[PDB]
């Protein structure tokens with residue numbers, strides 16, 4: 001026997017699933033962020049190692065992982081060595097790769113990730129191409145963090161009396177446990193660089209949007225179209241008329257709607273896909289150790 | 298005979314000037330930052346006492362100070378105690394107040410301060426008002442940080458090939474001494490959560506704009522207009538048709554123009570700051586202790 005573990009290490013959570021080499025599910029586990037840009041190398045590795053240990057219920061023989069944050073030769077150099085310590089055999093890819101291959105099983109295609117951050121990544125069958133996916137300051141259009149920041153800035157303007165307060169106002173304050181501008185200021189001193197925390201506010205935006213807040217809908221719409229525009233670009237670029245949609249942001253029905261309406265308008269078909277990204281990581285591990293992908297899917 | 302000192306305690310540095318109650322100059326001194334957020338309460342206080350100490354070299358009777366960093370009640374509770382003991386009589390206000398009074402002479406008015414951050418301060422004769430000025434993440438529309446971020450994001454888009462490269466591209470990359478996408482990425486992750494580095498990019502945007510880059514011009518325009526509209530809101534709430542403009546952002550001719558173009562369209566006139574903040578602090582003190590601002 002042998003224990004194969006697939007891990008999807010993101011900006012909010014790290015998800016791992018463990019299997020046999022015979023397509024038999026053994027377990028699952030989850031932990032905090034695996035994006036070292038968000039929590040530091042020690043925490044990221046520790047979280048990944050924890051999710052793996054949990055899902056495998058001990059030691060794993062092989063671990064395949066898709067990692068958010070591997071956005072430069074630099075990142076790969078800093079992360080690869082340490083991540084390679086978690087199991088005798090470890091395969092490392094960008095998180096966009098495992099998300100796509102979970103669906104295309106390795107074939108050409110384009111996937112859009114809208115989670116804590118965002119990215120549009122595709123495979124030509126020869127090379128991987130990506131647009132965006134370079135961190136919260138430089139990119140991550142339409143990501144949960146993007147949405148969260150937009151929401152926070154709007155609440156402040158409502159607080160300043162520059163705009164009418166809407167449902168969003170209370171939803172957001174509650175989520176971050178703030179009651180007034182004074183607590184918001186203090187909150188900013190301590191929480192401004194907590195990426196997953198800012199991104200968590202996206203849920204509040206969705207809540208408001210579902211309860212009729214047009215201001216929240218507007219935020220979701222702008223973010224969704226900004227990211228979708230990039231998906232259309234890479235789709236034409238690669239030559240495919242279909243893209244897969246993955247990530248926590250797509251849990252927002254409104255976000256998803258605006259995203260697909262924009263894609264449809266551009267002649268692009270969207271698919272939420274069938275499998276989770278960690279399954280794509282297991283697929284990669286299987287290929288690495290010779291286990292048959294057929295028993296898996 | 299009284300010794301009145303006005304103090305401008307900014308995040309970068311502190312300046313204090315002394316005068317008697319009859320408007321006669323006594324001296325001045327400078328010192329390190331006054332924003333305890335940038336250098337810890339202990340350091341800020343000692344510096345403030347530094348400038349004040351020399352400005353009037355020795356004891357001071359009254360001290361009016363504009364301080365950067367008191368953006369919340371917590372900040373006030375932290376700073377005020379020690380600050381109020383620097384002189385027998387000490388008046389404390391936001392650095393925006395003295396900047397405003399330096400121009401209005403203590404009368405009602407509105408002033409826009411657009412530098413690394415941005416804010417609109419106003420006084421209606423009875424109480425001080427404010428909009429924005431709440432930090433890089435939540436606020437600071439139209440600040441150097443704000444335009445710097447917009448530029449960075451646009452430069453990545455150009456690299457990804459989502460938009461045509463314009464002169465702005467090279468200007469931002471040269472300013473942050475980056476030549477690679479790999480290099481850009483690592484730069485952002487090192488300078489991510491520290492505002493000064495991002496705000497410095499605003500200079501490259503201005504330079505691009507001056508060289509005809511309409512894409513750069515547009516960033517300045519959207520920033521200036523987002524802030525300008527807050528200025529309009531406060532001007533109308535206070536009841537004045539004019540506002541004063543101060544800050545490094547107004548060193549950009551184009552930003553200034555877009556700002557004025559938008560103000561005028563809204564029936565509001567404006568003028569650049571024509572007096573130091575520390576003088577506005579002396580004015581704040583004068584107003585509090587009954588000294589004639591005209592003699593000043």
Ligand SMILES: Nc1ncnc2c1ncn2[C@@H]1O[C@H](COP(=O)(O)OP(=O)(O)O)[C@@H](O)[C@H]1O
Nearest residue numbers: 010011012013115116144199200206248251252
């Ligand atoms: N219904 C929803 N509407 C909007 N945002 C949501 C919703 N559900 C979850 N999210 C957001 O999506 C994020 C989680 O997405 P996820 O894909 O797991 O990210 P990552 O891969 O970076 O860990 C959180 O930041 C959360 O705020």
Ligand SMILES: Nc1ncnc2c1ncn2[C@@H]1O[C@H](COP(=O)(O)OP(=O)(O)O)[C@@H](O)[C@H]1O
Nearest residue numbers: 412413441496497499500503544545546548549
């Ligand atoms: N001509 C200009 N165009 C664009 N930005 C400028 C220009 N001159 C200065 N700046 C920017 O404005 C800031 C300086 O503002 P300043 O008023 O000195 O504020 P602070 O006291 O907070 O440093 C810097 O971030 C700088 O990049």
Ligand SMILES: O[C@@H]1[C@@H](O)[C@H](O)OC[C@H]1O
Nearest residue numbers: 069117118119133134135
């Ligand atoms: O690597 C990408 C990261 O930079 C972004 O923040 O989130 C999405 C990831 O794919």
Ligand SMILES: [Mg+2]
Nearest residue numbers: 010011095115
């Ligand atoms: Mg993810």
